[PDB]
Symmetry: C2
Subunit: 132 residues, 2 copies
């Protein structure tokens, strides 16, 4: 069982996502990455389910390219549902832009790359899966 | 004579710039922005002073399209009182690559506040001038 899977739009795959995968692996976290690229046509809910069935936590990179995939509204709202094992990260989006797709997601407190560096975010995520 | 001018890259003009202007005008503020689209030749300090002569405050939309205009590092480090940058759709790592000072400076941030909250906050500054 891994620590994280990271769901992301492909457009983000070789930028911020690879940065965050490398930083988290460098701290010793186990992260699924390659099989969690989201493309037009996929099922977000099923992809999230799949990841959670193999990992402690789910990271979803909330970016313009993420929302541009036009996901169903309820599956976005679903990311906010407690059992949380889903940790959104806001990346290069505005509040209004996120509320346009999901008000519940826009009010759910999450990590934000404009407030922390990729390293700082790695450390914080790492804290969730480490004994100290 | 004016409350704000909005310095921006052309890419933001019909998007975030439009939203902010509309919101601020709704609150009764006086704003111009049309003459303040920034290109590459421009001297960021000159453009800003030019606007500060005709306007109480000046807004700079710090987006990726602003940073893509390859501003001289010195103008970025001394970007900022009367100049108010707003971070728009950028990361900290991203801003830091252009100016470590600019990235550490507390500023407005659209990932934290809706356009309307940002407008209210800027509007309250007029009444404090």
């Amino acid at each position: 069982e891994y620590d994280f899977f990271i769901a992301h739009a492909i457009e983000d795959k070789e930028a911020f996502v690879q940065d965050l995968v490398a930083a988290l692996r460098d701290l010793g976290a186990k992260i699924f990455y390659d099989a969690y690229t989201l493309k037009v046509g996929d099922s977000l809910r099923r992809k999230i389910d799949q990841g959670l069935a193999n990992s402690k936590f789910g990271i979803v990179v909330l970016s313009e390219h993420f929302f541009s995939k036009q996901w169903p509204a309820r599956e976005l709202d679903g990311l906010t549902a407690m059992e949380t094992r889903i940790l959104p990260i806001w990346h290069k989006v505005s509040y209004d832009e996120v509320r346009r797709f999901s008000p519940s997601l826009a009010d759910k407190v999450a990590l934000n790359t404009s407030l922390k560096s990729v390293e700082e975010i790695a450390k914080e995520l790492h804290s969730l899966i480490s004994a100290w």
